[PDB]
Amino acid sequence: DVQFETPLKIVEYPDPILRAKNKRIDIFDENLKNLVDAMFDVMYKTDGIGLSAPQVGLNVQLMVFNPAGEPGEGKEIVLVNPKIKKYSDKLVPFDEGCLSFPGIYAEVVRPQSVKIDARDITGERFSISLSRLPARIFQHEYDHLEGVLFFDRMTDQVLDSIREELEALEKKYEEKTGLPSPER
Ligand SMILES: [Zn+2]
Ligand SMILES: [Zn+2]
Ligand SMILES: [Zn+2]
Ligand SMILES: [Zn+2]
Numbered sequence: 001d002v003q004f005e006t007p008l009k010i011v012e013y014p015d016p017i018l019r020a021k022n023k024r025i026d027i028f029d030e031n032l033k034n035l036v037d038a039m040f041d042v043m044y045k046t047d048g049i050g051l052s053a054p055q056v057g058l059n060v061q062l063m064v065f066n067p068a069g070e071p072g073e074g075k076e077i078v079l080v081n082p083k084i085k086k087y088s089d090k091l092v093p094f095d096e097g098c099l100s101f102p103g104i105y106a107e108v109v110r111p112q113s114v115k116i117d118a119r120d121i122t123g124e125r126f127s128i129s130l131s132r133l134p135a136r137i138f139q140h141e142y143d144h145l146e147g148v149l150f151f152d153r154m155t156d157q158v159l160d161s162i163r164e165e166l167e168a169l170e171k172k173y174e175e176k177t178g179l180p181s182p183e184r
Pocket of ligand 2: 037038041
């Protein structure tokens with residue numbers, strides 16, 4: 001259900017894979033388990049806090065994260081086919097970063113907490129409630145699963161604050177691949 005090469009590599013905006021639409025995971029096997037671990041690896045390697053499969057080249061509904069960002073020094077949470085059952089009616093701001101946008105940080109407003117439904121790697125379902133940082137990392141990654149990027153939820157003003165930044169990635173993309181980016 002998922003073919004990947006190890007060391008995983010981070011996919012950077014404006015690569016199309018980040019918008020490509022993700023298929024649900026319906027095969028809970030060894031491969032799926034090896035993937036999750038490989039995801040935590042590249043996440044920690046790149047000193048990240050969360051990572052979704054689209055970010056490693058796979059268009060499936062898989063996500064991982066650890067508030068700490070350090071191996072064996074936090075809380076590792078992986079989610080398969082996550083569904084947001086409920087989210088807070090109170091909004092809070094936070095400067096978000098993303099591995100697909102090297103060194104770029106801007107303010108994003110999101111509900112402070114959520115209630116999720118998901119499956120684990122064995123395919124067993126589970127439900128949990130997130131708030132604080134875990135809730136914030138979760139929503140950012142859930143969006144990735146919807147082909148939604150964090151600048152999509154920024155205000156017009158905060159967006160202007162990083163327009164040149166995103167523009168530089170579009171050019172870098174063109175220069176590296178030799179292909180025109182689905183920019184703007
Ligand atoms: Zn399948
Ligand atoms: Zn590993
Ligand atoms: Zn991200
Ligand atoms: Zn410009």
